[PDB]
Structure formats: structure tokens, C-alpha cells
Amino acid sequence: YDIQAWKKQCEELLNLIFQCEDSEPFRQPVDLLEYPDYRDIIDTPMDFATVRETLEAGNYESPMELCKDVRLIFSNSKAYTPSKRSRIYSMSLRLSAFFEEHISSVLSDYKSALRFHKR
Numbered sequence: 001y002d003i004q005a006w007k008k009q010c011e012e013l014l015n016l017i018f019q020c021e022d023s024e025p026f027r028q029p030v031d032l033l034e035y036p037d038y039r040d041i042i043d044t045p046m047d048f049a050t051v052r053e054t055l056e057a058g059n060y061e062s063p064m065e066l067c068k069d070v071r072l073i074f075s076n077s078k079a080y081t082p083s084k085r086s087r088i089y090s091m092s093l094r095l096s097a098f099f100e101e102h103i104s105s106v107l108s109d110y111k112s113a114l115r116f117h118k119r
């Protein structure tokens, strides 16, 4: 029933993601000195520290908005990878599976709480 519960649930899931070794390439913005052509390929950079800061600033209205930015981290990795067998891209796929497994109930609970509110 709780329309606000998603926020702390997302904070806890972000804490788990930061503990995951697979998140290391995605914890901070991609370094443009390390990858000079990054912005030629990627229009909208995204990373987990930016997601956490947006959440903590009260700049997400719903977990769907947070989920769209997290999914953008993964699609950027897929777009930038020179190979589907690359190390960083392979880490992104495992991390994506972990994220999707955990975000599912957060989204379902939120949508059901909002439907109850508007009943």
C-alpha cells in the first residue's frame, strides 16, 4: 500500500549493486581520457553514482524513472562494446540480470500501491 516505499528499496538495491564487483566499471562516469571517442557513440552517459545522487536529491518521482536510468547504463555498455565477449560488457550483463531480478518487486509494489491510491 505504501506509495513511498520504493525509495528506500532502491537505496538498498543500489547499496547491493555498489558491493558487487561487477559494478566497478559503472560506479562513476566513463572516463573520457581513457575512452576519447565515448561521446561520439554515447549520447547520454549514465552511471550508478549519478543514479544514487538523483535519488538522494529527490529528483526521481517513481522507481520507473530510476529503472530507465539504470537500463541506460547497460544499453550504453552494449552500444560502446567492440565485442559481445568483452570483459566490461560481460560484467554489465550479469549486473543487469541481478538488477532486473531485484527491481521487479519494487516496480510491482509501487504500481499496485498507486492503483490502490487511485481506486
Ligand SMILES: CC(=O)NCc1cn[nH]c1
Residues within 6 Å of the ligand: 025, 026, 030, 035, 076, 077, 078, 080, 081, 082, 086, 088, 089
Ligand atoms: C563496454 C563499455 O561500457 N566500455 C566503457 C567502459 C569502461 N568502464 N566502464 C564503461
